[PDB]
Amino acid sequence: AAQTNAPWGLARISSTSPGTSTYYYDESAGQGSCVYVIDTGIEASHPEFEGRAQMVKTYYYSSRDGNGHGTHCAGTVGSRTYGVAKKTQLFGVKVLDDNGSGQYSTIIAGMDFVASDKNNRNCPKGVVASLSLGGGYSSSVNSAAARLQSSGVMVAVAAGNNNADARNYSPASEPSVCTVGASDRYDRRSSFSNYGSVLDIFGPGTDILSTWIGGSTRSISGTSMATPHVAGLAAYLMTLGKTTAASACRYIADTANKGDLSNIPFGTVNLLAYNNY
Numbered sequence: 001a002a003q004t005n006a007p008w009g010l011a012r013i014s015s016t017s018p019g020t021s022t023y024y025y026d027e028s029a030g031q032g033s034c035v036y037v038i039d040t041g042i043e044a045s046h047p048e049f050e051g052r053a054q055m056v057k058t059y060y061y062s063s064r065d066g067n068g069h070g071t072h073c074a075g076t077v078g079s080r081t082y083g084v085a086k087k088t089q090l091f092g093v094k095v096l097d098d099n100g101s102g103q104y105s106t107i108i109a110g111m112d113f114v115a116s117d118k119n120n121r122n123c124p125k126g127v128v129a130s131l132s133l134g135g136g137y138s139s140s141v142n143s144a145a146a147r148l149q150s151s152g153v154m155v156a157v158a159a160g161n162n163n164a165d166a167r168n169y170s171p172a173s174e175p176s177v178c179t180v181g182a183s184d185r186y187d188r189r190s191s192f193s194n195y196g197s198v199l200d201i202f203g204p205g206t207d208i209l210s211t212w213i214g215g216s217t218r219s220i221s222g223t224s225m226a227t228p229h230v231a232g233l234a235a236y237l238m239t240l241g242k243t244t245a246a247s248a249c250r251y252i253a254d255t256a257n258k259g260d261l262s263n264i265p266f267g268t269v270n271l272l273a274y275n276n277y
Contacts, residue, residue, distance in 0.1 A: 001027045007082055008185045009204025009229055014275050016257060018187045024277050026240060030085025033235035034123035035077045036114045036153070037228070038107070038131050039070030040100060042092035043213045046071065048079035049090065056121075057113050058094035059106045066098030068213045072220060073132045075211030076228035077235070082210040082217070084232025085239070091121065096133060107133065108144040115151035126238035126245050130231035131157040132224030134169050142174035149177050154238070154245040156180055156231040158223035165196035173198050178234075178249035182206060182226040183272060188262045193223055195268040200249050202261060203229035203273045230273050237275070 003010065003023040010023035036056075043065050044053040053074060055063040065071045070092060075082045078090045095110035096102040111129070118127045129148060134157065135141075149155040155177035159166045166172040172179050172194065179198050182190035182205020189195065190206045205226035209219040234248040243251035256271035264270045 001025055007209040009208050010084060012204050013084065013229055013233060013273050014277050018185060025236065025275060026277055028087070028239050030078065030088035030232065030235040030239045032123070032125035033085065033239050034089040034091060034121055034127050035085065035231055035235050036091045036093055036129040037070055037074040037077060038093045038095055038110050038114065038129055039073055039133065040067040040096040040098065041065030041070045041094040042074040042090060043071045044092065046211050046215055048075055048081055048211045050080055052078065052088065053090040053092065055092040055094065056117060057110065059109065060094060060097055063092070063094055065213055067100050069100055069132070069224065070094070070096070071213050072210040073130060073224060073228040076208060076225060077130055077232040079211050084229055085235040088232065088235045089123070102133065104135065104138055104141050108140060111144040111148045114153060115148045118153060126154065127152065128154040128156065128231045128234045130228045131155065131171060132227045134158055134160050134172050136170065137168050137173060138170040141170040145171035145174045145177045152245050154178065154234045154248040156227050156234065158227045159194040159199055161192040161222050162194055163192055164194055166194040166198045167196050169194065178230060180223060180227045180230045182223045183261055187260050189264055190221065195265045197267055199268055201230055201252055201256060201269070201271050201273050202226065233273050233275060
């Protein structure tokens with residue numbers, strides 16, 4: 001399948017080269033997979049979600065996304081126009097308040113929630129969790145992400161936006177999950193992207209158009225925007241039967257575009273997520 005005039009990041013993940021604008025993907029499109037977006041919530045009535053999004057948990061007085069950040073990330077995973085996996089099922093877990101903030105204890109509870117809640121959902125092709133959040137190093141946060149991965153969920157986490165080594169941030173620094181850096185449309189490391197040996201992969205993260213609250217759209221930047229590209233890619237590849245939740249990060253790294261990015265510090269992988277379609 002081909003989507004013309006796609007957001008640059010979608011075109012990038014199906015291309016061997018930067019500078020094109022059509023997204024190419026197998027029409028299965030992640031059908032039968034599920035992706036949990038652990039964030040500020042999802043405005044599930046957005047027409048772009050087509051009834052495939054739903055809230056499954058909040059830790060706050062409402063499940064509404066009063067921020068936009070979770071809606072944007074969910075759109076990059078799975079919206080019809082802005083999403084990588086256009087037929088996946090999206091599940092919102094609101095661990096962040098409408099200012100985008102959350103306590104680590106709530107974030108941990110949300111990760112353990114997903115590890116159990118997937119047993120209440122129909123995801124025959126597999127389960128992914130996208131965590132566009134993080135803060136300073138916490139062994140408890142890293143352990144929660146490790147448990148979620150161990151339970152059979154492909155966990156993709158943002159590297160962080162500090163232009164620093166991700167080893168000092170969580171859950172970015174957890175070795176067993178997929179830690180995602182950000183790139184721009186010219187195949188440069190995004191200026192804010194964290195780096196370091198703990199990164200597994202880069203995805204598009206500068207100037208990413210997606211869904212927003214109030215039935216709208218906007219373009220924003222962050223490793224938060226790169227992470228859902230990789231989460232959606234994992235769901236897509238699991239639907240195709242190419243990989244599994246336990247192996248998808250490694251598979252994505254093995255099949256990535258190699259050596260295409262600039263300003264990658266010595267010791268950080270030079271790997272850009274690629275669907276090889």
